Ligand binder design. Structure first.
Ligand SMILES: CC(=O)N[C@@H]1[C@@H](O)[C@H](O)[C@@H](CO)O[C@H]1O
Ligand SMILES: CC(=O)N[C@@H]1[C@@H](O)[C@H](O)[C@@H](CO)O[C@H]1O
Ligand SMILES: CC(=O)N[C@@H]1[C@@H](O)[C@H](O)[C@@H](CO)O[C@H]1O
Ligand SMILES: *[C@@H]1O[C@H](CO)[C@@H](O)[C@H](O)[C@H]1NC(C)=O
Ligand SMILES: *[C@@H]1O[C@H](CO)[C@@H](O)[C@H](O)[C@H]1NC(C)=O
Ligand SMILES: *[C@@H]1O[C@H](CO)[C@@H](O)[C@H](O)[C@H]1NC(C)=O
Lengths: 312, 133, 133, 312, 133, 312
């Protein structure tokens, strides 16, 4: 007859002259469903089962299997928790995005010389095995017998890459445990490069009981560029580092998702799972990784690939 | 006088408590203001993101609308063209009903339909029976 | 010595006044900075709103422009179509002047205009007088 | 002739191929004028003649006619003023938008027990009639004879809706009127629910003279959800509540406008008045209420509904 | 007792040092927070500018695309129109090869090309040799 | 033949149906190159060779040729430096944009009466000639013999334009030079109009050595509107003004650029030079002056002015 046989299934399409008209054939332009699983190909996915990035960085005793983990995309679960000395990080999101975008947990140990103090402090809230323990990348120094001299140490950077140092400060609970751990009635930590400096002083006070402790630890970091030098001065309440992490630049990020991991192939990853990328648009999430399609607010956008469904 | 010294101690302690509580309440005000400014920046970020999303979505909607309009225009134009071509070659054998479809008055084997589909048709062999029907 | 105690009182009072005025001026600086940051956020909000308004207005302008273009195109195309149809049926009786209008050389009653408007016209009954005029 | 007779009045229209061309007929797509009046149908408009929302909430003596007012849109005039005890609200805009969006001023009085103090304090700056007065929704407690005990009261919420409590704190002017009104040399107010707490301490000092007073009042509010409980502890400088407002959710808002009110019908309301909504666009105000048309920056946008005005 | 007064001096000096260091560290925290908020506003400004630039550039891209589409459509439509006109006036002398070009079977002087270009042509004077070639 | 002869040079054009197709002829719509020179016509360009706007405002001894300079566009070079008393400006960008947008450096001197002090202080870091000197628009007052009374001066504004006053405060280095320059052990400057006030107190301390000095100067400004009055009160560390600048409103701005100046004609000026304005778009800089074309992110945008390059 005229060319189209008035198919029983109509296809409503959005135009600019009219609003919604009927055409013979139409195609969908928005992928709006997910498989439910996170492909592990060809990207390198690391599953942070019960640990966050900072706990796997510090050396929590139950994610000591994550030493020198190399990821292309870190997946963070919501069931993660900490089981060591209670701590605190000023500018937590900045450090989390800095370590997420680095892509490595490679830790080179360095030889610091702490003379006049006792090294390798432990805690009964951070049991490593059957005995007391602590974080694996830090060194808790206390008084040696009856005194605590002013530690003053230096470390130059002669290589051609940046070094990331992680240190901390100890906030005690009472005024008896300050002088019983650091003979000085007040502590102070100064960390200096050739172009910057950070000085912190412990804040004695009481805190909520957490896992059996009312003291705290504050975590700080420093970046040393090639050709610089680092000097650390202190007279108490210092959680020293043991070395440096190697800093890289590339394509890496982090994503919170509770989806399992399978062995498929997909180029985009959202917290809902992997999505195909044959269509130009998607309506799943505005947080995306890889060569994904752009996030729109509309659900069904149909593109006509034929003629009208009715004459006249 | 030791009494004067003790009064001085009392008044300096009073001033000490004064500056202590004053600094405390000022710091409380400052942290409150910090929090409210942080929240303001947060909602501003949210508004910016919402605006960007709306604008890009509307751009996509307009784009697909323009594409649909172009496609529909080209296809229905060429359809009207071929329909006029048929109407030209179908002069006095059949007649259009009004929906772009020709009701045929006579009967012809599939050879006639083939001749219509290839544009080589003579409507004279059946014009007599077409006028008769 | 009471003189030493009085000197201690004097110096602690000096330090007290020092920290008082220092805290005061620092708080003044802080509130000034608070006000300027508030104003910065205010003008940023204004800029965001202005940008959104401009973009949406331009979107509306482009939309109505596209609609106008489509309408004008369809109407003038069909106008040229019907004009060509008339020119076909008006072969050798009248002649177009150049603005899509036919100057008629002969006179005919309104029946001729009706026959033109219904597309059933024979330009032979008046072709003789048309060539004569 | 050709179809169009070249109308004497030209109609300039904006295109995308050209810029502005002439067509036979055209229609306007932007309603850019207002009537000047605010319809009171089918919306429920409340005219806050000389009072704002907060003064009608607190119980100012010259808007005591606004008790249990139900509005669909509150209209605030610029000639409004206050004629009671000078006060102050931290986070004023938040509370104004919270009460504006609630849509009711329904006040349920509750029985608080204040033992050891004198109730129903008054002021000569808040005359209710020929004598002294105060706000009608608050209770000013002072010392009873020679003492002011620590008030500690509780109130549970067993219903299934939220309750809004409004309280305050009194900032005196000198150190003699503090101890002559509250025997304690320093006041303190603690208000606590099962999940939050607010503690305020009065700030003694001098203020600008306002209506004959140099003291101040600060106004705070609390929200109690179903199943909770409220506890109030204090030892001076407390402006207690008398009950709670019922909190609702719906379609309500507030608008500043100095336009009169008539008995017409219109679906959109702007601070300039009611505007018809037959056209898709409007160029009056970007602040709007109801099913209004969107605000553009352009004044005249014309849509062609015919053919060109000139041949060729 | 002078010893009690000296102990009072010691403890008030301790409180003095306490409030001094506390105010100092609080001010340090405050200036750090000021700097980070300033940086946040800076990157927000950058994001707003980037968004505006992208949107305006895409608007320009879409505008020029629409213009190109309109131009191409009008020119190729009128080209097909004139080609059909030629094909009408070129009935049985030459034949189109498939790319909108007519292969001519006979030879004619430039007068024939002129007659083609002015639309006044008689394909009968050479139809015989055209069928012969 | 068919109409187009398949030109040897193809012209790729961007469409919306396809992506990039070939047409016969095309034109470029984006001017993306600059000449390298800054026209000085018909705009009035001022070349701040080794001075910024603030140094030419204060009266630096090596840009004393810039007195009463009238500009339409100020061009700031990167080789600029200061060779006078080290100073500091709170809200530097605000003042820079305020003076840049005023368009004049016209300075009217006024007669202030400073009784009890010594005027016209000098410095050996601001040599004006072979001897000591200072800024040319300010007056450095010090003690007269053995005392420094409280200066308190007034100046009314009876004209019909705004007046801009520039003053400062002196931050000494030690506690001996404070009392050797201002007998008071602490200074203070109060500047008041009928509607605003600014009070500053010098901050004694040590600074980095700059050109042989460790003291500083802080620079402030005041705006007096017609009908107002200015009162200045002080008891030390005051860098007084000598008059006022006349404030105008118009079309003026500032631009950082290191391009030479020629005698051509162009209507737009960017830090890269002058650009023609025959095309609607440009891809050089988003900072622009005059009637310039808008900045896009795309480099080549081609507009078709003909037909396709291939049949079918
Ligand atoms: C991991 C993740 O964020 N998943 C999101 C969820 O948060 C969100 O509520 C839902 C619809 O809003 O889409 C999905
Ligand atoms: C109540 C109200 O806001 N009315 C506005 C007025 O403020 C504004 O100045 C004017 C034009 O700008 O339009 C109207
Ligand atoms: C004076 C000036 O700003 N010139 C700019 C330069 O800063 C920039 O690096 C370059 C390309 O990015 O374009 C030019
Ligand atoms: C309609 O379009 C789809 C595109 O996926 C195609 O597979 C299908 O064959 C089309 N239908 C017809 C009748 O051509
Ligand atoms: C022009 O359009 C208006 C639409 O309001 C209509 O009322 C009017 O009749 C039209 N004019 C003509 C000549 O059709
Ligand atoms: C192509 O367009 C340019 C526009 O600058 C024009 O100068 C040129 O003559 C055009 N080419 C042809 C073959 O028309």
């Amino acid at each position: 007859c005229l060319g189209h046989h008035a198919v029983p299934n109509g296809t409503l399409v959005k135009t600019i002259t009219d609003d919604q008209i009927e055409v013979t054939n139409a195609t969908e332009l928005v992928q709006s469903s997910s498989t439910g699983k996170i492909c592990n190909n060809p990207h390198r996915i690391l599953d942070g089962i019960d640990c966050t990035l900072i706990d796997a960085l510090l050396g929590d005793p139950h994610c000591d299997v994550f030493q020198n983990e190399t990821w292309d995309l870190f997946v963070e679960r919501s069931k993660a928790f900490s089981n060591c000395y209670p701590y605190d990080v000023p500018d937590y999101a900045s450090l989390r995005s800095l370590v997420a975008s680095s892509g490595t947990l490679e830790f080179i140990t360095e030889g610091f010389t702490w003379t006049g103090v006792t090294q390798n402090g432990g805690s009964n809230a951070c049991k490593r095995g059957p005995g007391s323990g602590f974080f694996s990348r830090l060194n808790w120094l206390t008084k040696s017998g009856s005194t605590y001299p002013v530690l003053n140490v230096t470390m130059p950077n002669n290589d051609n890459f940046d070094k990331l140092y992680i240190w901390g400060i100890h906030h005690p609970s009472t005024n008896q445990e300050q002088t019983s751990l650091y003979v000085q009635a007040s502590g102070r930590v100064t960390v200096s490069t050739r172009r910057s400096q950070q000085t912190i002083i412990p804040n004695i006070g009481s805190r909520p009981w957490v896992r059996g402790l009312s003291s705290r630890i504050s975590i700080y970091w420093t970046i040393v560029k090639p050709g610089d030098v680092l000097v650390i001065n202190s007279n108490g309440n210092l959680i020293a580092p043991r070395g440096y992490f190697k800093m890289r630049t590339g394509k890496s990020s982090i994503m919170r998702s509770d989806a399992p991991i399978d062995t498929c192939i997909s180029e985009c990853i959202t917290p809902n799972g992997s999505i195909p990328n044959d269509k130009p648009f998607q309506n799943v999430n505005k947080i995306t990784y890889g060569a994904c399609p752009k996030y729109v607010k509309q659900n069904t956008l149909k593109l006509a690939t034929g003629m009208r469904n009715v004459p006249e | 006088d030791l009494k004067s010294t003790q009064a001085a101690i009392d008044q300096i302690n009073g001033k000490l408590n004064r500056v202590i509580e004053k600094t405390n309440e000022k710091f409380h005000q400052i942290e409150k203001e910090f929090s409210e400014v942080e929240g303001r920046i947060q909602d501003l970020e949210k508004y910016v993101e919402d605006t960007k999303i709306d604008l890009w979505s509307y751009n996509a909607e307009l784009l697909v609308a323009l594409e649909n309009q172009h496609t529909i225009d080209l296809t229905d134009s060429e359809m009207n063209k071929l329909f006029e071509k048929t109407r030209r070659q179908l002069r006095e054998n059949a007649e259009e009903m009004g929906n772009g479809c020709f009701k045929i008055y006579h009967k012809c084997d599939n050879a006639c339909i083939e001749s219509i589909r290839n544009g080589t048709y003579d409507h004279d062999v059946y014009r007599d029976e077409a006028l008769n029907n």
